[PDB]
Amino acid sequence: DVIQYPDTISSNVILESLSHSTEKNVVTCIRENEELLKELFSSPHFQATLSPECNPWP
Amino acid sequence: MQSGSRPHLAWQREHMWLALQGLGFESGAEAANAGKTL
Amino acid sequence: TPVNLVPEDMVEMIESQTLLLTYLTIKMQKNLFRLEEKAERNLLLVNDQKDQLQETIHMMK
């Protein structure tokens, strides 16, 4: 699952210096996570997903 | 004097507020549990 | 000596996002499995009603 699929084979970005890639990728992911967590937690549905119940039955 | 503060991390307010919402915090209900209005 | 001055103030920040995510996943899992467990039993309790009624209808046919 964690080995994301190669869907857009970006040929050059395989071996350019990891020591000047990793900190960028950490900051971009911290930013994605701040945006995603702040916009998940803005939803009124955000306690129902965390405590789900359903009744189709009449 | 030059006895400086480490920067006061704004995210430790924000991930703290998210931790309260995750733990199911309501600023209406838990203020009413204290006998107080929002 | 090099010094790789990547701030701790970011490493504790991402591991505060990891804790938010994994806490939410576990809070969902335990409450969702409880819904799925009784949702199958609620379907089984209605298939009991299906089976006997469909079989009674077959004898009456």
From Swiss-Prot, chain C:
Q: Which domain of life is it from?
A: Eukaryota
Question: Where does the record place it?
Answer: Cytoplasm; Cytoplasm, Cytoskeleton, Microtubule organizing center, Centrosome; Cytoplasm, Cytoskeleton, Spindle; Cytoplasm, Cytoskeleton, Spindle pole
Instruction: List the coiled-coil residues.
Output: 34-61
| Recorded family membership | Belongs to the HAUS8 family.
- Role description: Contributes to mitotic spindle assembly, maintenance of centrosome integrity and completion of cytokinesis as part of the HAUS augmin-like complex.
Q: How does it assemble?
A: Component of the HAUS augmin-like complex. The complex interacts with the gamma-tubulin ring complex and this interaction is required for spindle assembly. Associates with microtubules. The interaction with microtubules is strong during mitosis, while it is weak or absent during interphase. It is unclear whether this interaction is direct or indirect.
This chain's protein is named HAUS augmin-like complex subunit 8
According to its UniProt entry, this protein's organism is Xenopus laevis (African clawed frog)
**Which gene is transcribed and translated to give this protein?**
haus8
